[PDB]
Amino acid sequence: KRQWALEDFEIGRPLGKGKFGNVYLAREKQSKFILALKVLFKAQLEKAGVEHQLRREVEIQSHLRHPNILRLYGYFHDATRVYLILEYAPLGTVYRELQKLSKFDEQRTATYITELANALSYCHSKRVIHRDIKPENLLLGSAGELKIADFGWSVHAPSSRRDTLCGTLDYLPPEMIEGRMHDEKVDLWSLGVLCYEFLVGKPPFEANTYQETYKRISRVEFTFPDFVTEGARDLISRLLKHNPSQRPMLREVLEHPWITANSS
Numbered sequence: 511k512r513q514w515a516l517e518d519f520e521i522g523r524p525l526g527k528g529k530f531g532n533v534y535l536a537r538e539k540q541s542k543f544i545l546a547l548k549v550l551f552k553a554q555l556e557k558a559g560v561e562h563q564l565r566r567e568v569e570i571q572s573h574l575r576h577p578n579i580l581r582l583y584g585y586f587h588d589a590t591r592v593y594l595i596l597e598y599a600p601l602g603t604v605y606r607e608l609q610k611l612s613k614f615d616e617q618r619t620a621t622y623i624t625e626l627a628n629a630l631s632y633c634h635s636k637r638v639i640h641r642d643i644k645p646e647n648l649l650l651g652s653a654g655e656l657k658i659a660d661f662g663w664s665v666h667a668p669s670s671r672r673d674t675l676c677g678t679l680d681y682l683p684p685e686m687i688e689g690r691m692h693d694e695k696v697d698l699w700s701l702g703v704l705c706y707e708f709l710v711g712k713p714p715f716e717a718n719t720y721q722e723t724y725k726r727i728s729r730v731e732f733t734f735p736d737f738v739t740e741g742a743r744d745l746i747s748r749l750l751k752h753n754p755s756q757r758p759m760l761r762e763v764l765e766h767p768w769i770t771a772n773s774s
């Protein structure tokens with residue numbers, strides 16, 4: 511509904527990142543409004559032929575509105591790069607939260623998973639699978655709530671896509687890694703992995719090699735440290751089913767006794 515320009519902003523502190531662009535804290539000059547400016551170089555994009563995933567990323571996040579789904583405001587682009595005007599999440603990533611504490615207690619773990627479910631429950635309702643729920647794509651709002659960002663690798667569902675893969679499978683279901691066709695259940699496997707990683711402090715399928723992990727994932731080989739309670743073990747075991755149709759619906763997850771017992 512309106513076109514901006516790099517001149518309308520005052521870039522600030524580097525929030526971070528790598529490859530195509532660095533996300534900056536920026537300031538809309540007219541309203542003094544705070545936000546994050548994600549800078550992507552065309553040379554990076556073009557050469558990797560991502561044009562469509564950025565057009566997809568920018569189009570979906572372009573509408574979705576949820577408390578837990580980081581907002582995309584619009585964009586613009588000069589000679590050598592494209593800019594994405596994003597919402598700014600005050601508390602950073604959930605990834606640093608985890609490095610910071612090592613592991614989370616059943617309360618945040620129960621909360622993020624809930625917020626995450628309500629978050630996914632929304633995109634699913636619009637046949638939009640995320641397919642990329644790693645803690646690195648999870649941010650925190652000023653109140654500390656989870657906010658799903660980066661809808662790049664996102665697509666509609668059901669889908670068959672096999673896209674030369676990101677480096678890590680750690681968060682992908684047996685169906686996506688095996689190149690096979692998949693649907694919305696793909697985000698439920700991820701939610702299970704993301705839950706385990708929160709409590710144990712490491713992903714359920716972590717290995718040393720790409721091939722080692724792929725083996726561990728496809729045979730769904732995961733064990734529990736002693737401190738993980740039956741309550742969580744249970745939930746994580748219902749999500750980590752090799753066969754998509756056996757994973758729960760997001761209501762059953764928001765209902766799980768363990769989630770209700772510790773979600774604030």
Ligand SMILES: NC(=O)c1ccc(Nc2nccc(Nc3cccc(C(F)(F)F)c3)n2)cc1
Binds near residue numbers: 598660
């Ligand atoms: N290290 C801090 O103190 C810190 C980090 C991030 C933020 N907030 C924020 N909001 C929105 C976008 C964004 N970029 C960003 C950073 C890393 C990864 C990603 C990714 F795109 F991968 F999700 C985006 N970062 C605030 C403080």
